[PDB]
Design a protein around this ligand. Structure first.
Ligand code: BCL
Ligand code: BCL
Ligand code: BCL
Ligand code: BCL
Ligand code: BCL
Ligand code: BCL
Ligand code: BCL
Ligand code: BCL
Ligand code: BCL
Lengths: 358, 358, 358
């Protein structure tokens, strides 16, 4: 069993954090999904809407097929920071599964709060990783009740909310995090609070009744959860001077997995201090979560990484070390790098640092 | 290190869901039990008691030896559905450990509740897997206090129940799910509620004092928990027109594991719609749980599966595909099937579907 | 990828439980730490202070370097049993990270409580492993507020304690168990209670203000947690007739891990009943926890174990069996022992029992 993969990063220079990213992998092992074949495509686009205010138009299109059933999700959302801790979003979208579909619109705010930050930590740790915190969501959402399936589900939830007392917001968590999603919460050192429902009402919309709910929850992390530890970094609106996009797809069945990713986006490199830059620290959640599925078959690694620096730049530090260099082009394969690839595919979070400069 | 295994399924035809199942495995790796050697035999029998009412007499006999200590458990229980959601049980049994034994009798009800089921899901998903829900237990149990060990433990629990307040039903969970059982709860996306004790009293039985307790708990699942997702299917009383039975045993120590299973029971095949039948979907809990121990030693797979269909039937779909066919007899070995066997032994839940018809 | 390791145990005879322990390992795989290189040294010393009262002076010195930042911790503590269930400690120490340091002093009590112990278990199980219980901590600690970082953090916590209500003692847990420590709690069948703060005040110390807090928590275990299951055994004060010490260090980076351990301490052997002695049962937590990192790279085992018995003693039982014997010296390598080493490095808890006698 051989895992074949290839990765490529092409960096912009100057004050830019942008890079082009490409990833390909193929491995002839069964996927762990208990319905196969399963295929999926995703595209995400972000464009500056109002750069003066810092408003970003963010879209996502997801299409999948699971055991022959076609699913889609489309969301269009306007996102902006109000403060360094508070972010707001306004959007709309739709979903479909087979012959069924429904739409939605929403307004929400998210507030990120770090627990007990200190100057003594900040000035002594040059590259901090684990930052603990809690993140509060406040959501208003509206869904037209425009078929009888929607009406039935609306009524079912009204009954539970009215009658279930404290149980409703507690027990909803095993409904929400379906299948193996529930176990993955603790695996990443994450916590999900009970849900609080502030109001749930039917409003008279233009084309009929609309189910309107305002609700809240928080989630917390011990530092592995990048959504909290890296709140600001994960939304690089200041560097979005042009549209960014990423596209990915996979095909899987009982005899293999194939995946492609292609993107162009800011945030791929970061200032590392003292004139040096680094490839951004690897986010941890993806490694930890994928780690829950990456140990089911033995494999050997056939993997190359190519990094193309801006003209005139040079790698100052890399561990594992690159295998070859041709001017600004650097390549990793085999040896220590292959062992690192095996490690992260199985859930390991060992650091691979790349530092570069002029 | 080679894992040798063999599985065989022989199906009944017509409207029958019955099959004979045989499994053998031998692998020369240490078991994970921190006391070795450990051996165990189990037999389960079910026979129709009152088919008109749908009452089943269910017995279980377990015998084990752990670090030279002999344990037994015998239970005889009458089980029936009252409704599609509520099931009742009345039974008695005994247990022994070394020189100690005690008996018990009980009456209980279990109510299964799915969370928010919908017509839009039902009509669009041809083979649903994850179904979230919660399952309520109501138990009355009676144990004769007929030696001083029983009396001592009774008193210890009375103290905790009386004095412990809300702590008792909370903290009992780490007592109940001894050793690695506690960690396995979250692993399967399962939740166990605190216990509620309604009453605990000494009654005057025929041959002396009897400790009588009525207590309740619920457990919930995000869909991996088959006890909830597949509540009806897991008790195929309608197909029990004759006695069913299964027998299994293992021997384990620090240099190997050997296991045998032999059974004859309904529910091995299921209607898949449109004239097709399938081997029942693989239950998930066993894979997930065994997965917690299946990754401690590298192994290669030496494994065959034989499925014998009823005369005149043919496989319509199988993935991974069978290696050979001789009329109604189909065999799997090597290649993609061997990779699938490795996958599920390590905790993977990738679908292996077998569809057959006339 | 080959893991090279060597272990050695040299036992004292007579009524002594003492042994010398040596361990070496080197493996060329990346460590999982998301900051590398990381190096660490630890020394622990225990000496009898007041043998008549059973007071032990316990010190620990830890020095580490993480991504070039130097950290230290020094603690000196006087420990004694008050009863078989209650232990007290009084100590002081300091820590430093880069340019920052702070000191502390504390007094604490810990009470271990087993859940529902029974005579029927005790007399029938010759070597019990899983013992469920809960362990209560009561801590008074004092920290001089002698720089502005300390003052700032003090104020931050005062705000949370005053304003946070029940949330403070709940949410502190994901702060406390930073990074992957949080996930490891459930993995070992462990539970940590919310913290209760009894008082938090500034006192006027000799050299300025001192932050004084009294707080409580408990932790519980289903039996894997050795701190609870083996409470008495883990503090063998009765056998400490001379100083004991252990020293360990590791070096790790993205291309390997190297580790050394050297110690001399009581508790290495134990009475097994009927004139036999055993090497102490393997503690489980270390195996379970290390197990969370031991599955990220395939490896083969190159490992030897040497046990040197007291003169005239002989091994009565060992499984896996030793490979060779030269009078009192016994050696394990390859075969079943190598498979056992692989097993425990990956998180397995299979028993390796060694029994010896005259
Ligand atoms: C994932 C970890 C956390 C979490 C972390 C965050 C973070 C972090 C943010 C939000 C924000 C939002 N969250 Mg939240 N959120 C969680 C769970 C939820 C749930 C739920 C029922 O589970 C809901 C209803 C919401 C609701 C919301 C909205 C109020 C808001 C915008 C969502 C959106 O546009 O999605 C549409 C997007 C998708 C459907 C797909 C997103 C897929 C992943 C996450 C994209 C990763 C980036 C990818 C690697 C790079 C893209 C580059 C492109 C070139 C641009 N969150 C979980 C528990 N949430 C954002 C906001 O603006 O708040 C005001 C925000 O900043
Ligand atoms: C509503 C969602 C949130 C949000 C949540 C997150 C989270 C959470 C993370 C990021 C991360 C990143 N985000 Mg952000 N992000 C948002 C908006 C943006 C915008 C923008 C201006 O709108 C931009 C340009 C970015 C850019 C970036 C990068 C700095 C970084 C990914 C680096 C990389 O190499 O990716 C290269 C990409 C790949 C190698 C793989 C891409 C795979 C596919 C195509 C996308 C991810 C799918 C995901 C795994 C599954 C989604 C399931 C949902 C149910 C749909 N985000 C909004 C506000 N973003 C990650 C990071 O490292 O942060 C420090 C991270 O963990
Ligand atoms: C199993 C493989 C590992 C993995 C293995 C590696 C390896 C090996 C390397 C990197 C490298 C990098 N990875 Mg990584 N990486 C993973 C997941 C992520 C995610 C993420 C949101 O999931 C992000 C933001 C990143 C980010 C990054 C950058 C820090 C860095 C440069 C980009 C690159 O080479 O990408 C390469 C692109 C990929 C590996 C593709 C990952 C696609 C993931 C699995 C998501 C697929 C989503 C799917 C198409 C749609 C899901 C839809 C839902 C089902 C609804 N990785 C997965 C979990 N990554 C490189 C590096 O460190 O350079 C210094 C490097 O050498
Ligand atoms: C296992 C997952 C759930 C669970 C799921 C279920 C399900 C599902 C059912 C019950 C039912 C019962 N449960 Mg419950 N139950 C759990 C934990 C408990 C605990 C406890 C202290 O942990 C108790 C006291 C009970 C108590 C009870 C009784 C009230 C009742 C009958 C039990 C019995 O006869 O057992 C005697 C049986 C055994 C000792 C061994 C059973 C071994 C396994 C489970 C058998 C699997 C089937 C095997 C693969 C195929 C057999 C084929 C044969 C040919 C017949 N449950 C856990 C949390 N429970 C049943 C009932 O009738 O309720 C009214 C029922 O339908
Ligand atoms: C009190 C227990 C509950 C109960 C709980 C469960 C649970 C829970 C499950 C089943 C499952 C099944 N049960 Mg039921 N089941 C009960 C009563 C019955 C009766 C009956 C008429 O009395 C019958 C005929 C069945 C029949 C069946 C099958 C439809 C199915 C197993 C298929 C298979 O291939 O097994 C072939 C068997 C094997 C390959 C392995 C057999 C191994 C040993 C011999 C038995 C299991 C031991 C178990 C792992 C450990 C027990 C530990 C306890 C502490 C004692 N059950 C009662 C009401 N049953 C499973 C399923 O798939 O459901 C959809 C499942 O997960
Ligand atoms: C580690 C191995 C995996 C496993 C690997 C496989 C493989 C490989 C195949 C199946 C197949 C099947 N398995 Mg499976 N299966 C497991 C456990 C289960 C359990 C269960 C209750 O534990 C059930 C109901 C099933 C059910 C089924 C059917 C869906 C299907 C046809 C029967 C068969 O071939 O059985 C074969 C019988 C076994 C594998 C024996 C399993 C015995 C388990 C581990 C329980 C032993 C209990 C022990 C003796 C007593 C415990 C006592 C307590 C300690 C008190 N499996 C374990 C966890 N299973 C086949 C299939 O998909 O056909 C289409 C197939 O090819
Ligand atoms: C680790 C599992 C449990 C736990 C289990 C125990 C046990 C068991 C005991 C204590 C005891 C104490 N605990 Mg506690 N304790 C935990 C978490 C905590 C936390 C915290 C913020 O997390 C705090 C503040 C405390 C506080 C305290 C003190 C009141 C007291 C003495 C500590 C000390 O001297 O440490 C200084 C020591 C260190 C900094 C390093 C210790 C490293 C490991 C644990 C040493 C293992 C032994 C090694 C293998 C063999 C050494 C041989 C040498 C030759 C001597 N515990 C966790 C949850 N705690 C002890 C006591 O005397 O109570 C009155 C005691 O007996
Ligand atoms: C405050 C801490 C507690 C305490 C908590 C524990 C815990 C918890 C455990 C022990 C264990 C043991 N302890 Mg004690 N122990 C204390 C005081 C003592 C004293 C004493 C007279 O002061 C002595 C002589 C001992 C002796 C012993 C042995 C009986 C046994 C280890 C056997 C072995 O082979 O180790 C040989 C050692 C090695 C092979 C590895 C040594 C590695 C390094 C050098 C030390 C451990 C570091 C640890 C992994 C990480 C610490 C992280 C902290 C954040 C600093 N402890 C105090 C009271 N002790 C263990 C056991 O098996 O108990 C049954 C165990 O799990
Ligand atoms: C990954 C390897 C496994 C492991 C694999 C083995 C193997 C294999 C054998 C033993 C054996 C034994 N082990 Mg062990 N053992 C582990 C951890 C422990 C710990 C502990 C507190 O962590 C203890 C008390 C013990 C105790 C014991 C005795 C029961 C027994 C005889 C001593 C010996 O040979 O030591 C050998 C010494 C070691 C294996 C070194 C372990 C060092 C651990 C990993 C801690 C390092 C701490 C580090 C230096 C500092 C951390 C600082 C913090 C980051 C702040 N092991 C780790 C997790 N152990 C032998 C036995 O069973 O004889 C009958 C045997 O053959």
């Amino acid at each position: 069993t051989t895992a074949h993969s290839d990765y490529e990063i092409i960096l912009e220079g100057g004050s830019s954090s942008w890079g082009q990213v490409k990833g390909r992998a193929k491995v002839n092992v069964p996927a762990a999904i208990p319905l196969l074949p399963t295929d999926c495509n995703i595209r995400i686009d972000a464009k500056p809407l109002d750069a003066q205010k810092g408003v970003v138009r963010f879209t996502t299109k997801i299409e999948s097929v699971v055991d022959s059933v076609k699913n889609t999700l489309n969301v269009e959302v306007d996102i902006a920071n109000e403060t360094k801790d508070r972010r707001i979003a306004v959007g709309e979208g739709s979903l479909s599964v087979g012959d069924f579909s429904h739409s939605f619109s929403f307004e929400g705010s998210v507030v990120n709060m770090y627990y007990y930050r200190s100057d003594a930590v900040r000035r002594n740790i040059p590259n901090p990783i684990y930052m603990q915190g809690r993140q509060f969501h406040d959501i208003l959402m509206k869904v037209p009740l425009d078929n009888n399936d929607l009406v039935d589900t609306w009524e079912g939830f009204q009954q539970s909310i009215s009658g279930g007392g404290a149980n409703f917001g507690d027990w909803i968590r095993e409904f929400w995090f379906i299948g193996p999603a529930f176990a993955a919460i603790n695996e990443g050192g994450q916590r999900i609070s009970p849900i609080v429902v502030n109001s749930s009402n039917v409003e008279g919309g233009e084309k009929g009744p609309v189910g309107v709910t305002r609700w809240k929850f928080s989630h917390a992390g011990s530092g592995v959860v990048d959504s909290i530890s890296r709140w600001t970094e994960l939304f690089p609106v200041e560097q979005l001077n042009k549209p960014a996009s990423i596209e990915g797809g996979f095909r899987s069945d009982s005899q293999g997995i194939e995946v492609k990713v292609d993107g162009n986006l800011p945030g791929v490199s970061r200032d590392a201090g003292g004139g040096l830059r680094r490839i951004l620290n690897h986010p941890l959640i993806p490694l930890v979560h994928h780690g829950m599925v990456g140990k089911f078959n033995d494999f050997t690694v056939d993997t190359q990484l190519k990094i193309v620096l801006p003209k005139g730049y040079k790698i100052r530090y890399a561990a594992p070390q690159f295998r070859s260099q041709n001017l600004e082009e650097y390549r990793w394969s085999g040896g220590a790098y292959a062992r690192w690839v095996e490690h992260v595919c199985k859930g390991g979070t060992g650091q691979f640092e790349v530092l570069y400069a002029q």
